[PDB]
Design a protein around this ligand. Structure first.
Ligand code: HEM
Ligand code: HEM
Ligand SMILES: CN(C)Cc1cccc(NCc2ccc3ccc(N)nc3c2)c1
Ligand SMILES: CN(C)Cc1cccc(NCc2ccc3ccc(N)nc3c2)c1
Ligand SMILES: C[C@H](O)[C@H](O)[C@H]1CNc2nc(N)[nH]c(=O)c2N1
Ligand SMILES: C[C@H](O)[C@H](O)[C@H]1CNc2nc(N)[nH]c(=O)c2N1
Ligand SMILES: [Zn+2]
Lengths: 408, 413
């Protein structure tokens, strides 16, 4: 049935037909909603998925049922038959990668979806090769501050014993170190991964913002360490436009968010290594990275320097400090001509995107829990926007951390 | 359905195990292929529909008082069954009514204040027959709940639905709210949320003062009759003028708000019985006033004026002038209620208490249904502990439910 979503602020009603195309499961049932749970082949399984995907590709270029379409299905069937898998055409690789982004219900940045530079790395065979492809990606995407969205796609899974994996959760991240006195220097989120690099031979500077090395696994082999050339790593010193003391906090961050631990699924094929990157929404750094208790956790320090009353929660000293940090982040990136978007501009673009997608596509799967920013929720337009969440393919999926499945 | 569902807290690593979901009674709207978790709102019971619903509830009650399977349990079951057979409905005992109301609150997935669920004063108004009587009961409720600023949670329960043509309804969405007035020029005076209701009151004969904060009259329907207007005695309406501990100019904005949040348009369902008029009240979380009531664009919408008084650059969104003003307004709200000794809770305290409540519930009850979309506060989400807390949402009974607005269904006499 057609489903309607209302925006309670504008009263705009949109009608969703697209959800009828979903075949994957969401996690919820008729009796239990799991909307806030973070994470809820064979030849025989493979062809219908391949077919589903070839069909929507040829439907998308408006040549559904053409001789080209009929021949492609044939070629794929034969290939699955004779090899237990198949290879995508370049055009298909690009189409599928753009559509995995378009379908990512949790991403507020999807107005950009069709502007994605796709780097085909399916000829890669070694960790050195992966490193080369990754450097090129970082250089292209960074573009001296004028960030460009990109994805690099490594060879698809075969038997599962020969996966290509980027072990890093993002290409560029800061180390975290467990201290004898039990505290944590650097980023506490990366403590484990940092330990694995150390155990593997990495000589740690033991600073607060040490860029981690790349740990790269090719064809199921043991992962290998590489240092990203520093000239490729663009960073922004965080300062505040009014508090001249803010720079004295010694804060910085990297300009390029490049998630590298997801799995890209296209037409039944699985790409376990597909680092992709866009640009930051300010809150990702200013709210979560800096102010999560289990992350850099700087609220106290900033609040101190602001000389706030931190004796009672109801003084909202945390909220005040939170806003000023986010002002600083946006100001710093903007002053250094590095692409960044604030949560007001971003959510506004997402609403427009939604309207675009309902109009041309019959809907837009969206995960309110993720779309709504981690501060000032209800003063952004998405807070008041009803969303429907459903899973469309091609997609980006979670996968297990490689140190839990890998034998050495 | 799997027997054990686990929820994780991503900042503390605490994992909890839910079994209570097995007691889920109604559908959420989600299916295996779509989630409707951000959808706001996704003819009487027959004899045969009522029997198992009553038995389900009676069993649950007797289990709660450790008298399950007792002679008193079996006798109550038999007496209820007889009543349904010979009258096609039944009446709850006072003990059952009280247990039912507390549990509807305990089960309200969207409520962050549920640590308090067992301290609810229940006023039984099932003897009420007229709108003047409803007025008396509501006045008493307001006075008791207000308690000179030391607010006490309470519910007043009017007679249950019979044939559906004799419903008791409070037409107001909350017992105390401010009027809204649409102007010929398109502007709105007062609270734009309440324009429709205000118009209805004016048509019913209410003479509007036409101010910015006019307390709306009660519009009360008894026994399916046409609703009637009553003015709440103003001494019963506790209000707090909003000022700011630093900004001396904040008081010159002339804002105030009422101390008692008393939702009055919901339906209470107990054992298949339907109480269409069951006004209940607790106390405010500051953000309900400082974020939603004041800063929603479709509400009082004061961010701009505050921002201007704060001398902020309002030319770029990326200056975060809105966020900056929003915090100051919420500081003013908490400061003003605390100064006037009217109970209020800030969003940090409330969410931390809720996490403790939820953990206790998982341990003593086997779960705690929770709607993350509603539980996470409308500002500063991720610096409260509920943001990182996985939740499971499902519907248990007794429960509070939405019902249509009565002016849309009322057959005028
Ligand atoms: C171009 C600028 C972009 C912006 C501003 C943006 C913004 C965001 C934000 C703020 C989130 C929430 C992340 C979090 O809170 O941890 C997110 C999620 C996500 N984004 Fe985007 N994004 C962008 C580009 C991209 C690109 C290029 C891709 C892939 C080709 C992508 C795919 C995803 C996916 C799959 C998620 C969900 C991840 C998960 O489920 O854990 N995004 N995005
Ligand atoms: C005593 C202190 C209380 C606090 C701090 C509190 C807090 C809240 C808050 C902040 C919300 C979301 C409000 C919104 O954004 O509109 C809510 C919703 C709700 N509350 Fe509580 N509440 C309290 C008492 C009560 C009581 C006494 C009842 C019933 C007996 C109750 C039942 C509900 C229900 C049913 C909802 C969902 C409303 C809806 O779905 O529209 N609460 N509560
Ligand atoms: C844990 N892994 C999924 C990697 C990881 C680490 C930390 C945060 C996230 N967030 C997911 C995510 C995915 C894509 C993004 C694209 C752009 C952007 N600015 N943030 C994005 C964020 C993802
Ligand atoms: C729509 N109706 C349920 C009435 C209505 C009007 C305006 C706001 C709300 N919010 C829901 C709601 C329900 C119960 C509450 C109890 C206490 C409190 N502080 N807020 C509460 C808020 C509810
Ligand atoms: C679209 C969305 O469901 C709607 O804006 C909800 C979001 N969460 C909410 N949460 C609370 N507490 N109160 C609300 O009114 C809402 N509104
Ligand atoms: C429990 C909850 O699902 C979890 O904390 C989610 C909440 N919403 C989020 N939203 C975004 N954008 N990013 C996140 O990491 C999370 N975390
Ligand atoms: Zn759901």
């Amino acid at each position: 049935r057609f489903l309607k979503v209302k925006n309670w602020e504008t009263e705009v009603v949109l009608t969703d037909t697209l959800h009828l195309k979903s075949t994957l499961e969401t996690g919820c049932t008729e009796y239990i909603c799991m909307g806030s749970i973070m994470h809820p082949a064979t030849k025989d399984q493979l062809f219908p998925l391949a077919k589903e995907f070839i069909d929507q590709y040829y439907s998308s270029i408006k040549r559904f049922g053409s001789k080209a379409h009929m021949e492609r299905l044939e070629e794929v069937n034969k290939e699955i038959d004779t090899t237990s898998t198949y290879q995508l055409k370049d055009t298909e690789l690009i189409y599928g990668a753009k559509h995995a982004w378009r379908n990512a219900s949790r991403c507020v940045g999807r107005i950009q979806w069709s502007k994605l530079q796709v780097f085909d790395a399916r000829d890669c065979t070694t960790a050195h090769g992966m490193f080369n492809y990754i450097c090129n990606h970082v250089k292209y995407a960074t573009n001296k501050g004028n960030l460009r969205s990109a994805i690099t796609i490594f060879p698809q899974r075969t038997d599962g014993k020969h996966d290509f994996r980027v072990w890093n959760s993002q290409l560029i991240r800061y180390a975290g170190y467990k201290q004898p006195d039990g505290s944590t220097l650097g980023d506490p989120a990366n403590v484990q991964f940092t330990e694995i690099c150390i155990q593997q031979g990495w000589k740690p500077p033991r600073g607060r913002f040490d860029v981690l090395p790349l740990l790269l696994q090719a064809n199921g082999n043991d992962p290998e360490l590489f240092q990203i050339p520093p000239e490729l790593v663009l960073e922004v010193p965080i300062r505040h436009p009014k508090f001249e003391w803010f720079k004295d906090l010694g804060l910085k961050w990297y300009g390029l968010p490049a998630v590298s631990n997801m799995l890209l699924e296209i037409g039944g094929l699985e790409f376990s290594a597909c680092p992709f990157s866009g640009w930051y929404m300010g809150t990702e750094i200013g709210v979560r990275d800096y102010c999560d208790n289990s992350r850099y956790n700087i609220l106290e320090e900033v609040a101190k320097k602001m000389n706030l009353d931190m004796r009672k929660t109801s003084s909202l000293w945390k909220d005040q400090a939170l806003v000023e940090i986010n002002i600083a982040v946006l100001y710093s990136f903007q002053s250094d001509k590095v692409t960044i978007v604030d949560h007001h501009s971003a959510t506004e673009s997402f609403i427009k995107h939604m309207e675009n997608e309902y109009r041309c596509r019959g809907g837009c799967p969206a995960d309110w829990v993720w779309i709504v920013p981690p501060m000032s929720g209800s003063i952004t337009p998405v807070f008041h926007q009803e969303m429907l969440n459903y899973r469309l393919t091609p997609s980006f999926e979670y996968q297990p951390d490689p140190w839990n499945t890998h034998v050495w």
